[PDB]
Enzyme design. Structure first.
Site, short mmCIF file in Angstrom:
data_model
loop_
_atom_site.label_atom_id
_atom_site.label_comp_id
_atom_site.label_asym_id
_atom_site.label_seq_id
_atom_site.Cartn_x
_atom_site.Cartn_y
_atom_site.Cartn_z
N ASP A 279 25.11 3.01 -17.71
CA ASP A 279 27.16 3.15 -17.65
C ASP A 279 27.16 2.12 -18.16
OD1 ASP A 279 29.28 3.67 -16.10
OD2 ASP A 279 28.29 3.70 -14.22
N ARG B 227 28.30 8.81 -24.36
CA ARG B 227 28.59 7.69 -24.06
C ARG B 227 27.84 6.61 -23.48
NH1 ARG B 227 32.31 10.22 -22.12
NH2 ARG B 227 32.50 10.29 -19.63
N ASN B 228 27.07 7.28 -22.46
CA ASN B 228 26.46 6.31 -21.51
C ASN B 228 25.28 5.96 -21.96
OD1 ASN B 228 28.92 5.55 -20.08
ND2 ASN B 228 28.83 6.58 -18.93
C1 729 Z 1 27.16 -2.66 -20.12
C2 729 Z 1 25.37 -2.39 -20.30
C3 729 Z 1 25.20 -2.51 -21.84
C4 729 Z 1 23.72 -2.06 -22.46
C5 729 Z 1 23.29 -2.40 -23.79
C6 729 Z 1 23.96 -1.98 -25.03
C7 729 Z 1 23.52 -2.66 -25.81
N1 729 Z 1 24.03 -2.11 -27.65
C8 729 Z 1 24.73 -1.96 -27.60
O1 729 Z 1 26.17 -2.23 -27.27
C9 729 Z 1 24.57 -1.68 -29.47
C10 729 Z 1 25.97 -1.01 -29.75
C11 729 Z 1 25.85 -0.93 -31.54
C12 729 Z 1 25.25 -0.99 -32.09
C13 729 Z 1 25.00 -0.64 -33.44
N2 729 Z 1 24.37 1.03 -33.80
C14 729 Z 1 22.68 0.50 -34.25
C15 729 Z 1 22.71 1.07 -34.88
N3 729 Z 1 22.85 1.49 -36.01
C16 729 Z 1 21.98 1.96 -37.25
C17 729 Z 1 23.88 2.27 -35.70
C18 729 Z 1 24.84 1.47 -34.62
C19 729 Z 1 23.55 -1.68 -31.56
C20 729 Z 1 23.43 -1.68 -29.73
N4 729 Z 1 22.24 -2.70 -25.21
N5 729 Z 1 22.26 -3.36 -24.44
C21 729 Z 1 23.12 -1.76 -21.45
C22 729 Z 1 23.61 -1.61 -20.31
C23 729 Z 1 25.09 -2.07 -19.70
N6 729 Z 1 25.06 -1.63 -18.20
C24 729 Z 1 24.57 -1.06 -17.48
O2 729 Z 1 23.90 0.60 -18.15
N7 729 Z 1 25.54 -0.55 -16.00
C25 729 Z 1 24.80 0.41 -15.44
C26 729 Z 1 24.07 1.03 -15.10
C27 729 Z 1 24.40 1.46 -13.66
C28 729 Z 1 22.89 2.94 -13.60
C29 729 Z 1 21.69 3.57 -14.51
C30 729 Z 1 22.28 2.41 -12.28
C31 729 Z 1 23.49 4.08 -13.65
O3 729 Z 1 24.68 1.58 -13.71
N8 729 Z 1 25.44 0.11 -13.94
#
Ligand code: 729
Length: 285
Positions: A163, A146-147
């Site tokens: 995350d 999930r992450n």
């Molecule tokens: C909060 C969050 C969201 C995203 C984020 C989310 C997204 N895409 C989507 O959310 C999304 C959802 C649905 C679809 C559509 N579907 C795809 C294709 N279709 C065919 C099916 C469905 C496309 C994109 N893009 N980017 C990035 C970062 C974070 N934050 C975060 O990592 N914090 C962390 C990280 C860390 C570590 C690494 C130090 C542990 O600590 N803290």
């Protein structure tokens, strides 16, 4: 939080690129809350801090940006910038058009597409990211499908560690946790190793819930008694064997992520592994 003290001392707010709010446009919701946004054009993901939240959340929000920005690895999601001088506050993140790995697996199960090598590449990607995190002494504490995020759905997809932050005793992701974690609250890189083993199970089961027919309490009792999951359907032995090594009862006996990465790479060298057919779902069951 176990990471705030170090990040606070060794990372500056000045390291964060403040993007003028006027240059940010929210395009659509994706799943605080997360939107696809555009910066004037860069395509980004935008995490928001709801205005109703508190001062502890203010710290948490800033720290998320600072901690992400501390890393530089292809398999760890990027922080692109921030917009903290306007309300609601934003964090700008790498847009991952493939969505979360768990949803990807469930929606891309072979039906009457994916091959074993595709699954191995995802596992290698995340293992690569984990090795980097381990090498930099960062304990994730919630390695799970999930992450994990994917750049795109088709061939050439890259998997990365993120995350979403969803993690009382009823909120603990017990099914991803080793005994010393859910019994003693001990977290190390070897507790991340355990979780990665469960992630591997998720991957090669094509997105099943771990311990499918068990509740959290049942898993707690199962695992503390030496119980482990059986292989996912059609799972190659070499892959299952990695899982069972990640699940050694004592952390000292679990591999580090350098070893895990090597062993996964070895699997990709074995035609008998990568030519194994994934199971196919027959609608009527
Ligand atoms: C909060 C969050 C969201 C995203 C984020 C989310 C997204 N895409 C989507 O959310 C999304 C959802 C649905 C679809 C559509 N579907 C795809 C294709 N279709 C065919 C099916 C469905 C496309 C994109 N893009 N980017 C990035 C970062 C974070 N934050 C975060 O990592 N914090 C962390 C990280 C860390 C570590 C690494 C130090 C542990 O600590 N803290």
């Amino acid at each position: 939080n176990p990471n705030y003290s170090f990040a606070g001392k060794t990372s500056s707010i000045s390291d964060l690129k403040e993007v003028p709010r006027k240059n940010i446009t929210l395009i659509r919701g994706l799943g605080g809350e997360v939107y696809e946004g555009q910066v004037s054009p860069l395509q980004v993901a935008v995490k928001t801090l709801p205005e109703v939240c508190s001062e502890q959340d203010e710290l948490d929000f800033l720290m998320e940006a600072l901690i992400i920005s501390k890393f530089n690895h292809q398999n760890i999601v990027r922080c692109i910038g921030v917009s903290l001088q306007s309300l609601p506050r934003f964090i700008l993140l790498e847009l991952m058009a493939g969505g979360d790995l768990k949803s990807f697996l469930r929606e891309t199960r072979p039906r009457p597409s994916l091959a074993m090598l595709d699954l191995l590449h995802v596992a290698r990607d995340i293992a690569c990211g984990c090795q980097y995190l381990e090498e930099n002494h960062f304990i994730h504490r919630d390695i799970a499908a999930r992450n994990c995020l994917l750049t795109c759905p088709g061939p050439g997809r890259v998997a990365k560690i993120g995350d979403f932050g969803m993690a009382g005793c009823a909120m603990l992701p017990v099914k991803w946790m080793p005994p010393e974690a859910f019994m003693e609250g001990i977290f190390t890189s070897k507790t991340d190793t355990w979780s990665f083993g469960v992630l591997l199970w998720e991957i090669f089961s094509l997105g099943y819930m771990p311990y499918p027919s068990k509740s959290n309490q049942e898993v707690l009792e199962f695992v503390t008694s030496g119980g482990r999951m059986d292989p996912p359907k059609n799972c190659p032995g070499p892959v299952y064997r990695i899982m069972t090594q990640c699940w050694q009862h004592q952390p000292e006996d679990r591999p580090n992520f350098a070893i895990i990465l090597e062993r996964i790479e070895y699997c990709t060298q074995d035609p008998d592994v990568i030519n194994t057919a994934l199971p196919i779902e027959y609608g009527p069951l």
